[PDB]
Design a protein around this ligand. Structure first.
Ligand SMILES: [Cl-]
Ligand SMILES: [Cl-]
Ligand SMILES: [Cl-]
Ligand SMILES: [Cl-]
Ligand code: NA
Ligand code: NA
Ligand code: NA
Ligand code: NA
Ligand code: NA
Ligand code: NA
Lengths: 311, 311, 311, 311, 311
């Protein structure tokens, strides 16, 4: 069992095809996702060619150990894929049709910049290291690339499973390697975020702003500070479902901007009381009345500013 | 070892039967469940047929590698099932009776719309890919489909384990595939939710409404805000035991509706104090007295509205 | 390799014996426990008979694949046990003495009704499916059933590891199956619960009752509400270490009863203030003075009522 | 492949030696720790003896399957060790020198009585079941027992890896068993506890005592209660990193004693206010002034009492 | 299959080379990281040498079991690496060129002293134990040591993957062992820490300092205490993402220093109120006015002191 010799001096083209059966467990923090799929391979091994008329048989079946099969591996995987050979069928001309059903945990980076209104492009890289006798090149059999209709990724909308037809062939440790890119495009289901996180986070912020329609320092302190504790409960809840990014996220920006609205609200509450104690409530009431319009306006504008920078 | 040749031009019917031994680990967030069961298969392999008289035995045992066994796989599984072949018996006419004991983590979507008063239909899909020589079709042997009496799924009531007798035969990658549906119907045990989550969540909401039988702004602020913090503790507790659904859940609706009752309560508390400070407590007391009846009524009606829309 | 033929028409008795080496990881929420033990089996396979004069050895050793060994499996396990064959010894008559050391995660339901003062009976079910040639029956070798002295299950006291000597033989999928029950009786170590959960939970409840020796509504509100937040912290801590039971637990009952004592305390605090504001502190002080005795008495009686119903 | 026959009627001594390469993952709650080590075995198999002058080669190498190797197993392990045979060397007299590199999760109970100032003795039990032909006895080759210099157990100081030279030979299920004890003595690195848990826990307790230099009930209530909520946050943090012990721990004692200092502080705060309202602040101020000295003194003495009982 | 005999009395040099494909899962608490890489080995086995003329081939492919391959293992790993042999090529002079693709969880200690502005040096130790026949020595083939461009370690910047060319040869359990050090230098991505943890932690500290521009004890108590609760929420969040170090970390120092600023702030708040009640607000206002400058100054200086000691 060794590679098939070439007719002329040409490299062996292996026709690939991934058909997704299952898509599950997309870990945002770990930037991984689990996949269960069919892997279909096809090459020309002339040593296995036969006559169809005299044999009576049109297609010949083989066991994996009986024939030479190319060493196809995934690049961005945690461990080696759990493969179960489905079928090996040889045509009269010597064209092998290999099929296996695998399962693997794929390592694909995610861009959290527009979270939770973000979209992602998941990658599945097929690689084949060329042997000494002859060079091995990968090819996409678009007929054998797909996904079933039931394939559901919890909390995500699956757009398209496509493959970059042209492989990226390169030199690695003195040998040629043919690499293929299978792209799974997805968009996040941002519905749940609005009633669970966005709106409650806004209510607690507006509750803090009732301190502008009050002169009671003790009550105002309780208002701005207590809601700030509620806001801490919400920030810690969101920042845990996300990994530590070296960039600003859309959520992260909002979360941080809100922390300033709590700080400036304390400043106002402190100032209003300081002037009241300093026997000048004509000065305090004017600031407090300005804040009634200033805080919602500056908030609404700053959100438009951020939404523009991010989308 | 190859498929048995057909007498006429008919496809091979394989008689299936799943008998549940164990049902455990139903992950709501991951929409999975673990199963430990018997898988029983039966087909007609004429090449194995024997005259009982000459052989001197009316049953023939075979090791898996000795005879041709159909490649039966599960569709909605994480990895390939952990199978242990129990027995293979051949009757005189060549009817094989295969039995194995497997364990697999099944991927079955759950509908959380009526949670925790929801019911579910778990699926176990058996699939067989037809070979080149002949086509393979799946069949249900209702005599061999069941579950033992001890089978308990923690926090759920097991209704029925049944199978859709008619398989869904279709074409996939130019080959025929026969798919079978085993349905495990379950209903949730919603008892624990009432004393642990529902009632305490209602008490904290009613505690906030005592601010209608009080004129003290500082006390009212403490009442509505503190209880809101308690409510945040309960929402975060529930939304973690649930996945991020692109639809509204019965719990999610209630949870969100309660967040409004806290917001409107702050508005009232702010208004009552604003009028009191503006030297018109005849206006404030009338609103506060109205809210004493308005809040419980609007809450009870809104709950009837939601319960109607959801059930 | 097939079962030994019977002398007369009798079933094959297999002498079982489980000797616990390790007991660990009792997951209350999952109702599982890990075990590491010796499994000892014994049957008469006359085919393996030998003359020690002609063979030279008094007792013959064999590799698992060389001789017929009964397919003994556990019923209530997650996956198939991790077995390592220790020794196989055959005596001149053909009496096989099999020993293996296994490890398995056992699925045994727990009754949380009297938690954390509950006791449990863990089960380990041995099963053997009878072959077509002859019937297989399981038997208990009480000499080979035990546990070592060091065997410790963290947070539990191990009472006894015993076996139901009479197997439950029944019909399953056209064949006979002999089932054996190994019972591991345990009682929970409830010590830690008193200083960590019970007493702190009582202190925070009594702290709320200081609102009966105070007329300050603003202080009383802070007292009853803040301690309620502390109580929420403790309920969520306990209800997480427990699964969602369709029945009431001893802890669950107490936890819920305490939530009422917080609710009724708010009512009192609201009433006392309402009467004080309504210029009748002779009415308010009488209720507040009654509550000083009413709350500890009703609590003490309700605990006796619950403890009676549960024990 | 069977045990070597004895020269005179003596048992086979197997010279053991464990050399720790890695020590990691000490789970306090689970009372486990992971180990990666060399296991070195040595016995006299006269059947493998050879003439050194005639053969020409000093030492002869063998594959595991070629020669008889004793079935050495670990007692206190979760699953069977992950062993890779390093080398098998046979001297001319027939003395076998076996070496393997294993990795295993060890189950060793921990004594939390003096936590986090506690020391532990981890155990690694080697066992060998004696065969029918002859008895097997374990022996310690102190030259082959050790640990490398880099071996670090996060948060612990490794004292000594020693072995009890005398094995505990006993009868189990009719056969003799030779058990050996490898002890890994460790002491906890209690540094981190002081700035992270001990001191912050003391600050929050002292902050509650500022209520003795104040007559404001509303402020005192906020002081004692808020700091109690902070203390609950710290107790829940510590009690989670620890398992549920049927005995009192040094930390557990302190934690509980602090819960009393919070309770008695509330009593004082309630009393001081009750007397103030009852028009006798000469009585209230005297108690409050006494508690300024009483609370730090009783705390300092009670800590000396506990530290004495525990150390 | 035994080691190749030496020409003269020299040890066998094995030319190593690690090429990182994947770098992921750097567990700070566990001080581990997962790696997926190519391992390339090269030695001179004269017994495999051949003439290229009569062969008609420049290279000879071998199966792992066919030829002698050195027992290369990793020192600082949890379990034995998951290796898949890629290719084994033999040149005419007998120089073997071995390549495998492995995946392993590496145990490398981390220095948290400068966290989260810390840098790390990850180690991958290759070891080979010398056989009885001849000694084995490791060597670095710098041509075969690298990493691909896509290699990303979430939250870290990968500086350089280099190897210490000189192996550390030493005696262990009466045999020579050659050890090699592969160093992966990384620096933390400290960006996320500033908007998520550092700045919010500073805002809550400054919010507590508004108690210097207020005379209301009840408000000041609420200010300092509530923000202290927010600070506890942040300390517990940071100290969990870190292991228990027997040394002070840069974060740990800050965290602890902040706990003092909260304590001294309570002292001030207590003193200001005590003097106010003791009818001397000329003394209280002077301290409160001093604290307005004292607290930001001492904080700014103490941070410069710590930053100097740590960097
Ligand atoms: Cl792979
Ligand atoms: Cl499957
Ligand atoms: Cl089993
Ligand atoms: Cl290794
Ligand atoms: Na092959
Ligand atoms: Na077969
Ligand atoms: Na308050
Ligand atoms: Na057998
Ligand atoms: Na052997
Ligand atoms: Na070899």
């Amino acid at each position: 069992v060794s590679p098939p010799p070439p007719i002329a001096d040409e490299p062996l083209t292996v026709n690939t095809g991934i058909y997704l059966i299952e898509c599950y467990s997309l870990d945002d923090k770990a930037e991984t996702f689990k996949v269960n799929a069919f892997l279909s391979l096809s090459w020309k091994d002339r040593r296995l060619a036969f006559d169809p008329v005299r044999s009576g048989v049109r297609v010949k079946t083989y066991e994996p150990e009986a024939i030479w099969i190319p060493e196809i591996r995934f690049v961005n995987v945690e461990n080696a894929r759990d493969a179960d050979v489905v079928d090996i069928s040889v045509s009269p001309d010597g064209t092998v049709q290999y099929l296996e059903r695998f399962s693997a945990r794929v390592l694909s980076p995610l861009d959290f910049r527009r979270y939770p209104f973000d979209s992602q492009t998941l990658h599945i890289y097929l690689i084949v290291r060329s042997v000494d006798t002859r060079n091995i090149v990968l090819a996409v059999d678009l007929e054998k690339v797909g996904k079933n209709d039931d394939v559901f990724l919890t909390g995500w909308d699956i757009e398209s499973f496509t493959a970059v037809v042209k492989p990226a062939n390169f030199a690695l440790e003195d040998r040629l390697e043919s690499k293929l890119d299978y792209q799974l495009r997805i968009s996040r289901q941002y519905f749940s975020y609005i009633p669970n996180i966005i709106l409650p986070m806004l209510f607690i912020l507006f509750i803090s702003w009732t301190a502008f329609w009050s002169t009671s320092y003790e009550a105002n302190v309780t208002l701005v500070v207590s809601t700030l504790i509620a806001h801490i409960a919400f920030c810690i809840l969101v920042e845990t479902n996300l990994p530590k990014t070296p960039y600003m996220t859309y959520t992260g920006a909002i979360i941080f901007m809100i922390y300033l609205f709590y700080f400036v609200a304390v400043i106002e509450v402190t100032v209003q009381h300081y002037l009241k104690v300093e026997s000048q409530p004509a000065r305090a009431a004017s600031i407090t009345r300005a804040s009634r319009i200033a805080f919602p306006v500056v908030f609404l504008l700053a959100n438009i500013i951020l939404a523009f920078l991010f989308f």
